[PDB]
Amino acid sequence: MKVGINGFGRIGRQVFRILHSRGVEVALINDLTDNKTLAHLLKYDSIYHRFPGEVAYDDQYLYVDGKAIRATAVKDPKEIPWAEAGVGVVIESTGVFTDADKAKAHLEGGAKKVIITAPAKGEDITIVMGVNHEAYDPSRHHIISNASCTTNSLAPVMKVLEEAFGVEKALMTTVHSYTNDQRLLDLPHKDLRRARAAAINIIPTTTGAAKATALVLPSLKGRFDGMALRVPTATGSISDITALLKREVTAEEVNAALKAAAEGPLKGILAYTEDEIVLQDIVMDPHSSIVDAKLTKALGNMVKVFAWYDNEWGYANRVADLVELVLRKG
Amino acid sequence: MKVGINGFGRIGRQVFRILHSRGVEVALINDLTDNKTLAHLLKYDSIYHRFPGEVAYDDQYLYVDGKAIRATAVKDPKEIPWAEAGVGVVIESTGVFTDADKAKAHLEGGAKKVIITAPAKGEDITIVMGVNHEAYDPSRHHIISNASCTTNSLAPVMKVLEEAFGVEKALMTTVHSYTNDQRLLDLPHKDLRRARAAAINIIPTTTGAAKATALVLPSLKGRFDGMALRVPTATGSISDITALLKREVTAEEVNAALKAAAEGPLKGILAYTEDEIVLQDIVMDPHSSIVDAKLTKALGNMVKVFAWYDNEWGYANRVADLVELVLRKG
Amino acid sequence: MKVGINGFGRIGRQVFRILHSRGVEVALINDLTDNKTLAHLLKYDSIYHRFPGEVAYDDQYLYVDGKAIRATAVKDPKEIPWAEAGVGVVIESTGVFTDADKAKAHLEGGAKKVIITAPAKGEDITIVMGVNHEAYDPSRHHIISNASCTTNSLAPVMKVLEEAFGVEKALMTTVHSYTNDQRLLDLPHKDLRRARAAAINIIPTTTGAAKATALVLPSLKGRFDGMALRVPTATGSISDITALLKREVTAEEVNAALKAAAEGPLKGILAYTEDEIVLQDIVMDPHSSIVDAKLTKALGNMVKVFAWYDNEWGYANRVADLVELVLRKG
Amino acid sequence: MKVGINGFGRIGRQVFRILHSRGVEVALINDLTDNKTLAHLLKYDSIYHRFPGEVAYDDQYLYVDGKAIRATAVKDPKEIPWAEAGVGVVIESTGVFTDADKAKAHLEGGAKKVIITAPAKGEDITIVMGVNHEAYDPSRHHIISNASCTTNSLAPVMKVLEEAFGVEKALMTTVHSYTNDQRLLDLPHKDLRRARAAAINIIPTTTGAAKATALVLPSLKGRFDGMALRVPTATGSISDITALLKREVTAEEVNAALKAAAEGPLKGILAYTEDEIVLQDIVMDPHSSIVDAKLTKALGNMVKVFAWYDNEWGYANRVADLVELVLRKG
Ligand SMILES: NC(=O)c1ccc[n+]([C@@H]2O[C@H](COP(=O)([O-])OP(=O)(O)OC[C@H]3O[C@@H](n4cnc5c(N)ncnc54)[C@H](O)[C@@H]3O)[C@@H](O)[C@H]2O)c1
Ligand SMILES: NC(=O)c1ccc[n+]([C@@H]2O[C@H](COP(=O)([O-])OP(=O)(O)OC[C@H]3O[C@@H](n4cnc5c(N)ncnc54)[C@H](O)[C@@H]3O)[C@@H](O)[C@H]2O)c1
Numbered sequence A, B, C, D: 001m002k003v004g005i006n007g008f009g010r011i012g013r014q015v016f017r018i019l020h021s022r023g024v025e026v027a028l029i030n031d032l033t034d035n036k037t038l039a040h041l042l043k044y045d046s047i048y049h050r051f052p053g054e055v056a057y058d059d060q061y062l063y064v065d066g067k068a069i070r071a072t073a074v075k076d077p078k079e080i081p082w083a084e085a086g087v088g089v090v091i092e093s094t095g096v097f098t099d100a101d102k103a104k105a106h107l108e109g110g111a112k113k114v115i116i117t118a119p120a121k122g123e124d125i126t127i128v129m130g131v132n133h134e135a136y137d138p139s140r141h142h143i144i145s146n147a148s149c150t151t152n153s154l155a156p157v158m159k160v161l162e163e164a165f166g167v168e169k170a171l172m173t174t175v176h177s178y179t180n181d182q183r184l185l186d187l188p189h190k191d192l193r194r195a196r197a198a199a200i201n202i203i204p205t206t207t208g209a210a211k212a213t214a215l216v217l218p219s220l221k222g223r224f225d226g227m228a229l230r231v232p233t234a235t236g237s238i239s240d241i242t243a244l245l246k247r248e249v250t251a252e253e254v255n256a257a258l259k260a261a262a263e264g265p266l267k268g269i270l271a272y273t274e275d276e277i278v279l280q281d282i283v284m285d286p287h288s289s290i291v292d293a294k295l296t297k298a299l300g301n302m303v304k305v306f307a308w309y310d311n312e313w314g315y316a317n318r319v320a321d322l323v324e325l326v327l328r329k330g
């Protein structure tokens, strides 16, 4: 079965670049605009820059490195011709069909599996790769959430802290690049904070990411919450976790546990560095979570860990990983 | 007749602030959001900061310094009850009804005059205060345009150059803050350059402002064109005019003519400074066009003149001026 | 005694604006540049905009609303003739004389008191207004630190939490506007993080501000630390405090304690809001610490509190308050 | 002769990356900081991102892919040990030795050639590659200037216009990313405009780049001037040239002449595109000047041409080209 993308946006386009680079063929791309515009946005990217290959188009297809990909502008997911293009797995990256009752419309068009690139409601399962991907059951799990970028940044760290030390409870903040949910200048929005000019403000906004970590690490249920602060950067984020552990530790012990995890069982998901880096250094990093070791603090059993993540590229790599897992399992 | 605003956006809200400060009663504000949100946006502004007064609201009204203003969320302009609010002049600042055939819908609800806060299609006349406001005729002109921010920046300077020296031809660029037409991150847009992340790019885009200037100053027909470059600032712009004149001049002579106009016949429209200023210094300046004298260059008959403008506040002051003209004329 | 300023920078100039508005006479301003430049920088400010008054200069003086202020460019503080200008209290805001042994150079020129506008080493006392200003002893305390902007944001909140609930320990992060210590583009710096382009990065950096809060609240000694994240905003910051308290609390109780303190004993120092604000809304706020009530979280005895602060204007208001206290006490 | 770099800054480091990729050996790098910092700044770049190879250091050397490069911190050019490292060609990229009298100090350290990466005074020749590099005479030209980034953007376009149509005179503006000469927040500067916060302003500033174009195209002497507007982008610029030609032309003819030159005699120096691009699309482009064809305008004999350039990477490629020319000539 082939792969399809609904919503060729920031996440959809990076997921495409990654799948394409891995040889996983996407057969249909659907959005709301014409193919000239889809091609143009793929070709030129303000963050990741020129597509490393050839991009062309006509009224029916995008042509990427000589490969024809059907490309359409069908607003209602029930009407997307997935079956005709041979698509069995749909990446749902529009942002408007995160309710499973709406995302299931892709099955009417002949899809077998939908991966929602966001927190969902009513999904069969939420997966964070490296943390609970072994819980995926291909016979029962058809509408699947890959969680949020922030949850993917948190869960690997929290898994390590729980397994090495035990976690009584924790709170976090993510200091996070702006995204297309926000506003360029002050403008009506359902969230009166996100209404405000994004590139000249620090903007507090509610996040379900810490609560949602309990979906993949049930030990955190009812004892993990947090906040987001959106700041004037275009991609790249950092999670600042303050945890109360079940024993007293040093910063060095916390770092050693995270390093061991990054080099071993969580390799490719969790990364670890002791370099004095900044945001631009993690742009286009494929990891979910990049521990910045020099920032770790400990006051007995109370610790502070920082983990960077490129909220576009890192997360998109996880969507691609999940697509490959779903394909592997049938 | 009372005044009404359709589109309580960046321009609509600043025009409201200005009219309120002048004692001009706005009796109805219409947008697409609830009154909590309208009140919030008025109260807290990322550029002009806290509204100088009390703002409150309920389901039917905004309350500003005690005074009740009907506040609604009616998507179709034909259905706004301007008549019941006593509104005769509508400020059309949504950005989606710049075609006079659509803006005329306000007359169905009982308005007598519509001021479109943008370049228009099919309007009765386009007015630039200080340049052709005497052409406004209340017996002929009912749907009128106040032109663009850029046209209002250019026309006062071009008037002076034409009258003092004569203009053979001219080209211009405006280096211009981003606006809400643009995108925060790369996203589909009808204009493939405006599709791109606004706060991390210089973005070329087409402008009709020079051609529009050549109509309010008709002697320049076919002799004036230009371009815009959108850059990462939140408000404030500068026009860079290169003109071939009908004789040799000096920079000093050009500056003297502009200063004379600013101090006399174009006072309140054209300003003049010799200070070494930058963008932040012209934020909330009420002028249409602010000549930066130290930037003026001349090579014989070829000159270069720079004029700043706050594309929100300055333009909003001109809308308010046009509103007061229209009210005065009946 | 009259007041002098050494270092007419971001803090020095705002302190001047504030003292001038309060009628406190500044008799000498010293920097490294000429009076034309000092006058220009006071007149035009990229954040606080046009100085509300007339500014002029000559080779020996700045003139503010017609009042002459001696203005010089003397690099060695031992050579500034404070006593000749009648100056007894020096505001030391250069950033390079925060070691008390260096700040004492002002005493050679006849000053009696030096207020270092930063954390210091070897000072007689560090004061945070509203927290320990009553500890000031005019007979013995001559070299005084007003602490950092961040310490001033933290100490009022920590005082309230200790007094209402008891604080076992705490960690914090400040998400903080860039400052002139940082680099516009990647450039050598003693801090490899601060070496990096400030306006296109989130930049972690060490802060002593939580540890230094123990200077004014000794109960926190060995029990409070944190981190800074510098982000692309030009002024305005927020402190994110995670505290372990001595009993279980609700977010409502934490907010009520902070509101009571803001409305009572800490009025003018600590503020409290329930509005959904963003950074631009706290620019030019005079408070040290502005609790954002809707962001408060509690999980049993672990709480999370956010306090905004304008790192320039708020802090400058505290410097001015301390200046007035020192003058009052003799 | 081997190559040396004095001033391992924005230009110095990119020139290093480019020479390294070309297999041109750099044998000494001098700056004002320690080798840890030089290695760190090479390794991690906020624009061009991770150095594509291994970087290490000790007290005496940097190591790039295992190759040892002497690395020192000698403030006085006369004292740099160029002779011991076998260096015959010094890239002078500190910004403080653009006067040939000071730059000549490298020759008494054993160097034979100095390429000043900026406009110079007293130099033996100023070269813009593609325009007058054939004038380089190795027997007489010791101290060589590679001109400014802006001059390199202008001269290729002006050469084409003169040769195809004839140029009577011209004026230009460059809309230009901020650079390390500028200030992060308002701070004293010799240039009162450049004193101002760079990332929240449009900042007009003088440029000698159009006048300096006459050094390589003498027909433009006294007939070409312009201005710069510094805007909040971290690299990437665009030149906006308004030229009066010696006959009437269309935009199509102008574009055809620029395309022919880009595809033929000026290949690798001048590029030509008809794509609808923005600043991020030209970051890390190696060309001096990239014509944006869709922006070209003509009114009779008055034309307007826009040419993009990465002021770091493009210019650094020209420094590398000139180094290779100087090496080839002996
Ligand atoms: N950007 C991030 O950092 C990030 C990270 C992880 C997850 N996500 C989630 O991924 C989803 C997409 O986010 P994004 O940032 O890529 O958004 P985006 O706004 O950049 O892209 C959304 C795309 O969906 C298209 N679209 C909207 N409605 C459609 C419809 N009915 N049919 C087809 N196409 C439609 C839009 O035209 C646009 O191209 C959201 O759920 C978001 O929460 C975003
Ligand atoms: N921002 C500037 O610099 C500037 C300057 C001069 C002119 N203008 C023009 O003014 C107009 C408004 O621009 P803006 O920047 O304020 O835009 P904006 O996007 O900030 O505001 C538009 C407002 O219109 C509302 N709206 C949209 N559709 C509506 C509808 N059908 N009914 C009622 N309300 C609706 C939106 O909710 C929003 O609040 C545009 O035509 C723009 O081109 C803008």
Ligand SMILES: NC(=O)c1ccc[n+]([C@@H]2O[C@H](COP(=O)([O-])OP(=O)(O)OC[C@H]3O[C@@H](n4cnc5c(N)ncnc54)[C@H](O)[C@@H]3O)[C@@H](O)[C@H]2O)c1
Pocket: C006, C007, C008, C009, C010, C011, C012, C030, C031, C032, C033, C074, C075, C076, C093, C094, C095, C096, C098, C117, C118, C148, C149, C179, C180, C181, C311, C312, C315, D186, D187, D188
């Ligand atoms: N900016 C903030 O947010 C902030 C807040 C609280 C405290 N502070 C502290 O206040 C001090 C100043 O900070 P700033 O942001 O105003 O810095 P700044 O760089 O804006 O200003 C420093 C001023 O001192 C002048 N100066 C330097 N050396 C001098 C000397 N030898 N003699 C006279 N003048 C000299 C400089 O020319 C400049 O005008 C620092 O200690 C800083 O840590 C800053």
Ligand SMILES: NC(=O)c1ccc[n+]([C@@H]2O[C@H](COP(=O)([O-])OP(=O)(O)OC[C@H]3O[C@@H](n4cnc5c(N)ncnc54)[C@H](O)[C@@H]3O)[C@@H](O)[C@H]2O)c1
Pocket: C186, C187, C188, D006, D007, D008, D009, D010, D011, D012, D030, D031, D032, D033, D074, D075, D076, D093, D094, D095, D096, D098, D117, D118, D148, D149, D179, D180, D181, D311, D312, D315
């Ligand atoms: N950045 C651009 O866009 C650009 C483009 C073309 C030319 N230039 C020119 O290249 C030169 C460097 O510009 P930049 O942007 O790389 O500047 P930069 O400030 O980034 O780098 C300058 C480097 O020189 C070092 N330095 C200063 N004095 C020194 C000394 N005495 N000895 C050794 N090293 C010293 C500094 O430590 C720094 O690392 C300037 O002349 C500039 O005008 C810059």
